[PDB]
Write an enzyme that holds these catalytic residues in place. Structure first.
Site, PDB file in Angstrom:
ATOM      1  N   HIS B 351      70.838  54.135  17.755  1.00 24.07           N
ATOM      2  CA  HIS B 351      71.061  52.833  17.113  1.00 24.07           C
ATOM      3  C   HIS B 351      70.015  52.408  16.077  1.00 24.07           C
ATOM      4  CE1 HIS B 351      74.340  51.689  19.944  1.00 24.07           C
ATOM      5  NE2 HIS B 351      73.642  52.426  20.792  1.00 24.07           N
ATOM      6  N   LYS B 542      71.568  36.436  13.301  1.00 29.77           N
ATOM      7  CA  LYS B 542      71.163  37.729  13.873  1.00 29.77           C
ATOM      8  C   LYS B 542      69.735  37.576  14.390  1.00 29.77           C
ATOM      9  CE  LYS B 542      72.167  39.436   9.851  1.00 29.77           C
ATOM     10  NZ  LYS B 542      72.938  40.723   9.894  1.00 29.77           N
ATOM     11  N   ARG B 543      69.270  38.535  15.190  1.00 27.60           N
ATOM     12  CA  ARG B 543      67.882  38.511  15.658  1.00 27.60           C
ATOM     13  C   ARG B 543      66.885  38.482  14.485  1.00 27.60           C
ATOM     14  NH1 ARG B 543      66.986  39.567  21.312  1.00 27.60           N
ATOM     15  NH2 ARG B 543      64.783  39.379  20.721  1.00 27.60           N
ATOM     16  N   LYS B 548      65.565  42.871   8.538  1.00 23.76           N
ATOM     17  CA  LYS B 548      66.793  42.119   8.273  1.00 23.76           C
ATOM     18  C   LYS B 548      66.581  41.109   7.140  1.00 23.76           C
ATOM     19  CE  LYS B 548      68.605  42.518  13.023  1.00 23.76           C
ATOM     20  NZ  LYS B 548      69.960  43.116  12.791  1.00 23.76           N
ATOM     21  N   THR B 650      77.054  44.619  13.172  1.00 21.65           N
ATOM     22  CA  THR B 650      78.399  44.290  13.648  1.00 21.65           C
ATOM     23  C   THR B 650      78.772  42.855  13.325  1.00 21.65           C
ATOM     24  OG1 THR B 650      77.526  43.831  15.858  1.00 21.65           O
ATOM     25  CG2 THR B 650      78.561  46.002  15.489  1.00 21.65           C
ATOM     26  N   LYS B 654      82.361  40.802  12.007  1.00 31.03           N
ATOM     27  CA  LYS B 654      82.841  39.526  12.545  1.00 31.03           C
ATOM     28  C   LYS B 654      83.151  38.522  11.429  1.00 31.03           C
ATOM     29  CE  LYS B 654      79.718  40.291  16.485  1.00 31.03           C
ATOM     30  NZ  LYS B 654      78.505  39.773  17.201  1.00 31.03           N
TER      31      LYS B 654
HETATM   32  C1  LIG Z   1      63.345  48.820  22.783  1.00 26.09           C
HETATM   33  C2  LIG Z   1      64.629  48.222  22.204  1.00 26.09           C
HETATM   34  C3  LIG Z   1      65.512  47.517  23.027  1.00 26.09           C
HETATM   35  C4  LIG Z   1      66.679  46.975  22.483  1.00 26.09           C
HETATM   36  C5  LIG Z   1      66.965  47.139  21.124  1.00 26.09           C
HETATM   37  C6  LIG Z   1      68.247  46.530  20.522  1.00 26.09           C
HETATM   38  O1  LIG Z   1      68.697  45.472  20.970  1.00 26.09           O
HETATM   39  N1  LIG Z   1      68.782  47.231  19.504  1.00 26.09           N
HETATM   40  C7  LIG Z   1      69.891  46.900  18.817  1.00 26.09           C
HETATM   41  O2  LIG Z   1      70.546  45.881  19.054  1.00 26.09           O
HETATM   42  N2  LIG Z   1      70.251  47.743  17.844  1.00 26.09           N
HETATM   43  C8  LIG Z   1      71.459  47.490  17.010  1.00 26.09           C
HETATM   44  O3  LIG Z   1      72.625  48.194  17.545  1.00 26.09           O
HETATM   45  C9  LIG Z   1      73.839  47.812  16.880  1.00 26.09           C
HETATM   46  C10 LIG Z   1      75.010  48.494  17.610  1.00 26.09           C
HETATM   47  O4  LIG Z   1      75.047  49.894  17.303  1.00 26.09           O
HETATM   48  C11 LIG Z   1      73.780  48.127  15.363  1.00 26.09           C
HETATM   49  O5  LIG Z   1      74.917  47.551  14.715  1.00 26.09           O
HETATM   50  C12 LIG Z   1      72.492  47.566  14.725  1.00 26.09           C
HETATM   51  O6  LIG Z   1      72.366  48.044  13.382  1.00 26.09           O
HETATM   52  C13 LIG Z   1      71.252  47.941  15.556  1.00 26.09           C
HETATM   53  O7  LIG Z   1      70.053  47.358  15.016  1.00 26.09           O
HETATM   54  C14 LIG Z   1      66.072  47.833  20.305  1.00 26.09           C
HETATM   55  C15 LIG Z   1      64.907  48.377  20.844  1.00 26.09           C
END
Ligand SMILES: Cc1ccc(C(=O)NC(=O)N[C@@H]2O[C@H](CO)[C@@H](O)[C@H](O)[C@H]2O)cc1
Ligand SMILES: Cc1ccc(C(=O)NC(=O)N[C@@H]2O[C@H](CO)[C@@H](O)[C@H](O)[C@H]2O)cc1
Lengths: 810, 810
Positions: B351, B542-543, B548, B650, B654
């Site tokens: 991811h 978003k976070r 970002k 994602t 939406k």
């Molecule tokens: C240590 C750690 C724990 C959780 C995360 C986390 O929440 N990552 C995350 O949400 N990644 C996102 O995944 C989505 C689904 O595939 C993608 O659309 C996003 O681009 C990606 O940043 C990242 C690092």
């Protein structure tokens, strides 16, 4: 099947069966193909629970409309046991549910065994609260039980290599179908902080907040459609608690630890901070609830007319200064008026005269945890001592004896003295106990305020302790005198006219024999121990304490063994001697006593010469549900505490009701039991209270008994030399040393009379007809010891309310 | 009311109403006189839940009879949000429940707002798992989601003085009606201990045991009567834990802390022991469950034919050596055979390419906690590197690059390298992302095993993300093309023939306006903030992360403000700029970014010259339920990550589905979105991946941009001088320093093109008809981004199963 278990109507059975299947499907999310016995239990529990709901809602709405005086029973312990069978009994559903489950291809008794005991108590004090709840509902009182929802109740006891091992009682693992969480009624409780003095009163500031979430459990009266509430508080951290981030969230455990576990020390008071937090937690949350309900009916003069608070021992004694705090600091009443209200609201029940068991909280603990309450206590003390000084001028020693503040190395608050000062009524729990309070430990207080002191002899509920656990006996009684005795136990006197009735004699003896066979079968199936059901079932079940003298029982057991070994071919009445009970985890002597019992069994049970003539069994994990099994099976009830030490006892009453004869000292309620039945129908032995007093004045020398009784000398020499522990010869040196040099409870002094009296028991047992006739005389006179009588006395003489046997509409 | 919400039949409404009243009475123990809105919500929840039960039982029994290949989706995160409306939608119950509650005098929308989000995820990765569960059920796959039942999910975000404050998300406080505890399926999980070598294999001994108790939550497919299971593990101490006595009981918390809280750090990997325990806990409990179910259908050759395990990132990567441990140590298979089974069973989804986010566990942690797993990992590494050496002889650097063991100060295990080695398939989450994996970080692995590498472009479920959150839009689409598009989103292409349809243009614009009015009203009612609903709703939710580039958004906002202040009487398109998202609690720069946003708002929102032409609002506590509200109200979707950094995104999908236009970089799934809609229908700007690469080779000098762009210089001087923080002039010095000297994400490099592109957005918005026509072109081509397409691709290309749209019997 049997009459007292109610009707099994076509409509009811059909309705129960479909509601059972509905719960299995919708509530448990299972079909008959994947369902375990536990699933079947829960489907049944939910089905029976449904029948409570309507009655529960309308009972509470009834109290709202009628607005009677409310009784608040405050206890740190509610020893409830199982709820399923009790609910069926009180709702007249037992036969219908039995039939319904039978038709579904299930055995209800098997399903009943799956329920965990609610073991939220240590022993007698906690079980008394439970019996009391049942009676208050049965007598139509607007009563609420208030306590703590412990996540872990009294430990499960395992016996490993003869020793007690403790394991966590995770009684909520599978869920509790009986409780309803009420997170909407969550209340804040304050700890620590400091006291700030302003122009207009004192202010308790900078406190830490713990939330109290209530869980309500229904308490059904016996077939009167009354369902009262037991409300238990659970501790919850507020959401901004400690709010690196991860640790802050994990630290929420600290706050929630308050309701985590029941303190199992019933022998010795321990000034532990977590216990103090528990005591305040229940008190603060409860009083806010009481006051809210009182307002939702300004003028606090009418408070005592609508509210009674009963303190189960000193454990919730902080209710007194907490009520003062709310009335003075928050409601702005003057001190004298608030005190008047408080005194008329509160009453205190004492459960022991043993000094090590009394709560004496160090001042430094209260100073840190509850700074405002300490200030209020000091003010109570000053004003109380001013009254003493005015009543007894110049009596400086009385002033220091009566003070709520005890001076010494560490200053302490005597919680019992706080309770007497702040209560309109103080009661002991048996006539002899209440008299001892007036003559000894509370003498000064009695001389100041004689009107305050009362007796309320303990009782047990005949619903759980006859109908539920001994339906066979209940049924044969009902055949002769009808069913009304179940909520009017004095009617058992009518059984005196059947003492020479050949059919009744035969039926009484038959019920006992069946109960013994059933229990003999329980022992093999669940523990693989083998017993002769034709032997006399000699049983002592209760918590392990020196004062209860399980050790005296042990000396008798060894005497019997030694007499058999001396004359092997002589006839003796065969006995199965059963001793059971838990020891407080820090009570070393009590743990040694358990080991001794198992050690005796190991020798006695494997001696070929003994045969089936003598068996010694330690009953593992004694608890409410085990009591319901063993008590109906007992022939001989051992109630052998040193005179003056057992405040009342209640196990004694359970045995009397269920057809056992009693061997006992004139202690606690044994005195009144012998008075009711007749001394000729009781196996009384040993020192009376006066004889103990005389021995203390002279000095108790155990060596004297050892020197003068050859049979006792032999036993001590066997213990010392390693006869009962061949691989660790000095294992029982602590026991011998205590018996010889520091026995507070004079075990040797009662030994001779005890053995003698035990011979008289065996002699009677040899005459089955005469044994049974004495039993009938005991059962027929056990009516006084119903907790319905006890509660009617509290109601009339302390709370100022009239009980009612009248039904609410169904 | 509206068609897509189902039928409201007389029979159904009557049946729902009585089951509602039944639950209020029997389940909640309340009458209409004392019931709160929360009670009404729970009565409704229980009523809807009843409709799931039959389908849930028969779906699981169907899988038992048919024995298809099972899909196991393993994730540390499931970002579920609320369940009530989703369940009604998938069961076609929404209109019936709306009518039923209306007749009972209740508003269902009000009741829906009472449900807590299941916030068991951080953001995109956790939400992807949730969308995936919905699609797998809808496509009739025998799928199970496996994770942890966190007591506390993602923190609730409060904004105090402009700063983020975190508070515990106590989402289970009031209970969870959707879950069913399964304490009968409790499994042991082992930690610590040591490895013992015997004549016949290795033995993992002297371990500490933690129990895993499962809770099952139903996952309904869209109107196909399929209900799958999400199983979440809760940590329980065994009853002999630590078994002075009191402390032993309290210490049970240590074990149960495993499932206490979700780690909220989504920016930076932290080698924390509690997190490792969580990762193993889910893995060990899950694999035991899988193997049990496989046996209850000896020959493990067929294991990969009946089992697929999907790893959501490396978080559950311990599944690979845990499967090896079970197969080799317990089942006694030879290494090579076990490895063959493992590889064919497991697949891994990546991811992110950001190195700080990748899991690299210190060897000393694994050595202590999981000694046998470390041994297995070392053995995997040796055998894998032997393959590399044989394929690339003499390439010693490749050997150190590809090693699962990273040397250095602290030795670490690269969990991503473990996953590639032990999986038959590795996938990225958007075409550009998957290509970057092959060209950069996993290049060596791709050269060794090219067949292993795939693309699976992310998607979102059109059930939650259209029908549920935007019924107005769903309905106007259904009017034209019918209802089949809801489970066949490619059918939205049919809307291209309505791009010049005057009625449709008017309806599309009308739905957006109503959504904006409704959200404008939400802002006033719940937060007392006031907005002009005629303005362009410019939203970035978003976070909070540097990559970002919320900061780039901030620079644009300030530019608009400055241009207004320079020429006050010039017309500008009014905007409401909404930025929302949570920052990881330890991410200092992200917390500074939140403070900047609020600081800008404080200046912009109170300037009289600005008026209602520009508003800046920080959306507090952004979560799934807030997304369902704001996304339908948005006009402009900000997707402005530095090219090459956002794996997919994602949120972008939406917004596209709900009628917002997109301003974005060619990053992640933005590329494919622009490809589907046409570049003319997208607001594309900035550096492509290649331009970033060129800038890195040359060296990024931010000073160059500052020197050459007067408008950017002004902003930086305003930030530095304290224009946005008059009382703390140097509050934003860290932000300025980072932008000027250590910006990994080249904010300044895209500034000019971004502002320019933003002018093109405002220009189009001025022409309402043409704006709406471009919107229709976006909605009509959003079909590819349904998670039904994504899951069908996983199923066919990775798992080897065929999806099915066929109904199960009701
Ligand atoms: C240590 C750690 C724990 C959780 C995360 C986390 O929440 N990552 C995350 O949400 N990644 C996102 O995944 C989505 C689904 O595939 C993608 O659309 C996003 O681009 C990606 O940043 C990242 C690092
Ligand atoms: C610190 C502490 C805590 C609990 C106890 C406790 O459990 N006490 C108790 O059970 N007392 C018994 O109360 C019964 C009910 O009144 C009486 O029948 C018994 O005689 C009395 O010992 C004692 C001390």
């Amino acid at each position: 099947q049997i009459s007292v278990r109610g009707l099994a109507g076509v409509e009811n059975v059909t309705e129960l069966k479909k509601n059972f299947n509905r719960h299995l499907h919708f509530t448990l999310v299972k079909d008959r193909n994947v369902a375990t016995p536990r699933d079947y239990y829960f489907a049944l529990a939910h089905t029976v629970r449904d029948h409570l709901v309507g009655r529960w809602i309308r009972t509470q709405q009834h109290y709202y409309e009628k607005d009677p005086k409310r009784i608040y029973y405050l206890s740190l312990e509610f020893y409830m046991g199982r709820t399923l069978q009790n609910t069926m009994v009180n709702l007249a559903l037992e036969n219908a549910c039995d039939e319904a489950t039978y038709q579904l291809g299930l055995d209800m008794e098997e399903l009943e065994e799956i329920e965990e005991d609610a073991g939220l108590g240590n022993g007698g004090l906690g079980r008394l609260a439970a019996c009391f709840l049942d009676s208050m509902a049965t007598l139509g009182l607007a009563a609420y039980g208030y306590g703590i929802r412990y996540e872990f109740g009294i430990f499960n006891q395992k016996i490993c290599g003869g020793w007690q091992m403790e394991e966590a009682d995770d009684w909520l693992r599978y869920g509790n179908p009986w409780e309803k969480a009420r997170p909407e009624f969550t209340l804040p409780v304050h700890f620590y902080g400091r006291v700030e003095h302003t122009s207009q009163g004192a202010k308790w500031v900078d406190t830490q907040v713990v939330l109290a979430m209530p869980y309500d459990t229904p308490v059904p009266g016996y077939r009167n459609n009354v369902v009262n509430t037991m409300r238990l508080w659970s501790a919850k951290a507020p959401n901004d608690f400690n709010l690196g981030y991860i640790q802050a969230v994990l630290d929420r455990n600290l706050a929630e630890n308050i309701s985590r576990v029941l303190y199992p020390n019933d022998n010795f008071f321990e000034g532990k901070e977590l216990r103090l937090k528990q005591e305040y937690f229940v008190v603060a949350a409860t009083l806010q609830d009481i006051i809210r309900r009182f307002k939702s009916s300004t003028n606090f003069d009418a408070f005592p007319d609508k509210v009674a608070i009963q303190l189960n021992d000193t454990h919730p004694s902080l209710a007194i200064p907490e009520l003062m705090r709310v009335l003075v600091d928050l409601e702005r009443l003057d001190w004298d008026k608030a005190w008047e209200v408080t005194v008329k609201t509160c009453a205190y029940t004492n459960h022991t005269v043993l000094p090590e068991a009394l709560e004496r909280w160090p001042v430094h603990l209260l100073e840190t945890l509850l700074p405002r309450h300490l200030q209020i206590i000091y003010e109570i003390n000053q004003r109380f001592l001013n009254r003493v000084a005015a009543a007894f001028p110049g009596d400086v020693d009385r002033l220091r004896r009566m003070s709520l503040v005890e001076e010494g190395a560490v200053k302490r608050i005597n919680m019992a003295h706080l309770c007497i000062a702040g209560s309109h009524a103080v009661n002991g729990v048996a006539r002899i106990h209440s008299e001892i309070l007036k003559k000894t430990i509370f003498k000064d207080f009695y001389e100041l305020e004689p009107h305050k002191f009362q007796n309320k002899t303990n009782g047990i509920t005949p619903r759980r302790w006859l109908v539920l656990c001994n339906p066979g006996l209940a049924e044969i009684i009902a055949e002769r005198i009808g069913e009304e005795y179940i909520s009017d136990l004095d009617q058992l006197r009518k059984l005196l006219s059947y003492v020479d009735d050949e059919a009744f004699i035969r039926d009484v003896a038959k019920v006992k024999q069946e109960n013994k066979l059933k229990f003999a079968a329980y022992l093999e199936r669940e523990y693989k121990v083998h017993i002769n059901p034709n032997s006399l079932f000699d049983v002592q079940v209760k918590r392990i304490h020196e004062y209860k003298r399980q050790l005296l029982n042990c000396l008798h057991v060894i005497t019997l063994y030694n007499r058999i070994k001396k004359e092997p071919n002589k006839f003796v009445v065969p006995r199965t001697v059963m001793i059971g009970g838990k020891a407080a985890p820090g009570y070393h002597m009590a743990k040694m006593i358990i080991k001794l019992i198992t050690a005796i069994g190991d020798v006695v049970n494997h001696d070929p010469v003994v045969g089936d003539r003598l068996r010694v069994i330690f009953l593992e994990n004694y608890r409410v549900s085990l009591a319901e099994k063993v008590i109906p099976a007992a022939d001989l009830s051992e109630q052998i505490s040193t005179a003056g030490t057992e405040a009342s006892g209640t196990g004694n009453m359970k045995f009397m009701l269920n057809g056992a004869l009693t061997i006992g000292t004139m202690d606690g309620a044994n005195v009144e039991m012998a008075e009711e039945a007749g001394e000729e129908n009781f196996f009384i032995f040993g020192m009376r209270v006066e004889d103990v007093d005389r021995l203390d004045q002279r000095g108790y020398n155990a060596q004297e008994y050892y020197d003068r009784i050859p049979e006792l000398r032999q036993i001590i020499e066997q213990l010392s030399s390693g006869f009962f522990s061949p691989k660790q010869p000095d294992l029982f040196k602590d026991i011998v040393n205590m018996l010889m040099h520091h026995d507070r409870f004079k075990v040797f002094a009662d030994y001779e009379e005890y053995v003698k009296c035990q011979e008289r028991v065996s002699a009677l047992y040899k005459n089955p007809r005469e044994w049974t006739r004495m039993v009938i005389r005991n059962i027929a006179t056990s009516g006084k010891f119903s907790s319905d009588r006890t509660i009617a006395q509290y109601a009339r003489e302390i709370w100022g309310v009239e009980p009612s046997r009248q039904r609410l509409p169904a």
